Amino acid sequence: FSDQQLFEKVVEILKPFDLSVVDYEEICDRMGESMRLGLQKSTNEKSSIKMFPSYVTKTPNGTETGNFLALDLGGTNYRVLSVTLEGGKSPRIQERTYCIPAEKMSGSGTELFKYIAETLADFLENNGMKDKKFDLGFTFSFPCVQKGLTHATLVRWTKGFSADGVEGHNVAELLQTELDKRELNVKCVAVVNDTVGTLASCALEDPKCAVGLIVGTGTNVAYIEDSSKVELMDGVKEPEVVINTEWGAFGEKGELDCWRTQFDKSMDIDSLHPGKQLYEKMVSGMYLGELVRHIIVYLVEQKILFRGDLPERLKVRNSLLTRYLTDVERDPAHLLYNTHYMLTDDLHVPVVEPIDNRIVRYACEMVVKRAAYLAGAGIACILRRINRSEVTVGVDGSLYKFHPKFCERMTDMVDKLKPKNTRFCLRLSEDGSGKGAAAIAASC
Numbered sequence: 001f002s003d004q005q006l007f008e009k010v011v012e013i014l015k016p017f018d019l020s021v022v023d024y025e026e027i028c029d030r031m032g033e034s035m036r037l038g039l040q041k042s043t044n045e046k047s048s049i050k051m052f053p054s055y056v057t058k059t060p061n062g063t064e065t066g067n068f069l070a071l072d073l074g075g076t077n078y079r080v081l082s083v084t085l086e087g088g089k090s091p092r093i094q095e096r097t098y099c100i101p102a103e104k105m106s107g108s109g110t111e112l113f114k115y116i117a118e119t120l121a122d123f124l125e126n127n128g129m130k131d132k133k134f135d136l137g138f139t140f141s142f143p144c145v146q147k148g149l150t151h152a153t154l155v156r157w158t159k160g161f162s163a164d165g166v167e168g169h170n171v172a173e174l175l176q177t178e179l180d181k182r183e184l185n186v187k188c189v190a191v192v193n194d195t196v197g198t199l200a201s202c203a204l205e206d207p208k209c210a211v212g213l214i215v216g217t218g219t220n221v222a223y224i225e226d227s228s229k230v231e232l233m234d235g236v237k238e239p240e241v242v243i244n245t246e247w248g249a250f251g252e253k254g255e256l257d258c259w260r261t262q263f264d265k266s267m268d269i270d271s272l273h274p275g276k277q278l279y280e281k282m283v284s285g286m287y288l289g290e291l292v293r294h295i296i297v298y299l300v301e302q303k304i305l306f307r308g309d310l311p312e313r314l315k316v317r318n319s320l321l322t323r324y325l326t327d328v329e330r331d332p333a334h335l336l337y338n339t340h341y342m343l344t345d346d347l348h349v350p351v352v353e354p355i356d357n358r359i360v361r362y363a364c365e366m367v368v369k370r371a372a373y374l375a376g377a378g379i380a381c382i383l384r385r386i387n388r389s390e391v392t393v394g395v396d397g398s399l400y401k402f403h404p405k406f407c408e409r410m411t412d413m414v415d416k417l418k419p420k421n422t423r424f425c426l427r428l429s430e431d432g433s434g435k436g437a438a439a440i441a442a443s444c
């Protein structure tokens with residue numbers, strides 16, 4: 001039909017993505033309903049939002065002294081760090097990022113945990129500081145049942161991991177074993193989640209930071225809570241504890257069933273761990289690109305794109321990276337240059353037309369717009385829980401960093417839903433979870 005006609009079809013199909021402020025008020029409303037259920041013993045096991053207490057009760061003040069190691073696992077890239085704190089000056093740091101072989105993440109646990117040690121050792125040798133004894137802060141980006149900071153148990157693998165022999169085990173001991181099998185003098189290991197690590201890096205700088213948001217390969221938030229409410233923590237002594245919400249799991253009990261579309265379902269169905277992390281799959285960087293691919297492939301079989309031809313590339317899963325959604329977003333009205341280049345250059349689509357470019361940039365915008373707003377609802381929900389009148393939020397993640405308009409839009413959503421008397425501000429966590437995990441390690 002007319003190009004205009006074809007475009008109007010794309011609008012009608014992608015309409016279920018065009019959510020209203022009222023929709024978000026509700027997601028947020030239902031979300032908050034789940035978090036308070038997860039803090040309750042009689043209702044945690046029937047809630048998707050686990051609210052795992054991290055046992056980090058008091059955030060690092062800066063007086064911490066010493067030199068510690070710090071690993072980062074789960075995020076976009078494996079960082080091996082070394083921190084020196086003296087409170088005093090700014091914590092000295094040194095670091096590396098090691099690529100991990102695709103196999104390592106799906107084979108045996110001992111094999112992955114062996115790789116971890118294999119790697120750290122190199123760092124220690126090259127920097128000429130091996131025999132020195134340390135205290136490692138392990139930022140393990142996954143849901144774990146914390147039994148104190150040192151003993152952490154994997155609940156389940158999220159994201160792109162599926163190593164056997166890890167789930168249900170104490171990860172700190174796994175690492176500690178392999179470290180020993182490499183003659184490395186690694187005394188302690190504090191297991192901290194990335195959100196928790198972020199909240200710490202953030203508190204160390206800003207005294208008002210009570211939240212740690214991660215919007216990268218995956219989404220999750222952590223916040224300071226009243227330890228009188230964290231029932232699974234038992235009758236404790238300190239007033240507070242950093243809670244690892246692990247909200248990626250929202251929707252796992254049918255809470256987002258009215259807002260999830262067919263693209264969300266066929267993307268989910270075909271994912272690594274089907275049916276798990278339903279809210280995350282609508283928000284994070286590992287899945288947003290896959291959403292536009294799914295829409296496309298659908299649009300192509302309806303003859304609404306590429307005259308019905310699907311390119312070899314877009315047949316392979318993850319062939320349409322979220323990174324593309326970055327350049328595509330800088331496109332003005334009468335200007336589909338970045339979109340165009342993407343179809344032809346990154347995806348090698350054979351024959352491409354203006355309608356295709358236009359249709360595709362709209363698919364991106366839709367997906368990316370709802371993504372930000374969803375995280376935004378979530379922070380508005382946290383702010384409604386924390387209740388403090390001045391909340392500094394520590395952020396991190398490719399989405400926040402590399403995406404034009406992401407934080408720009410997220411904030412607008414937190415703005416329509418935050419407590420009218422709360423003043424908040426997103427403060428990017430520049431030095432990562434490393435500097436934050438090390439201060440935590442300083443006590444272990």
Ligand SMILES: OC[C@H]1O[C@H](O)[C@H](O)[C@@H](O)[C@@H]1O
Pocket residue numbers: 074075141142143158159193194195214216217218219220221246248280
């Ligand atoms: O990377 C951020 C988040 O990714 C996934 O959601 C993990 O399950 C979660 O533990 C982590 O915090």
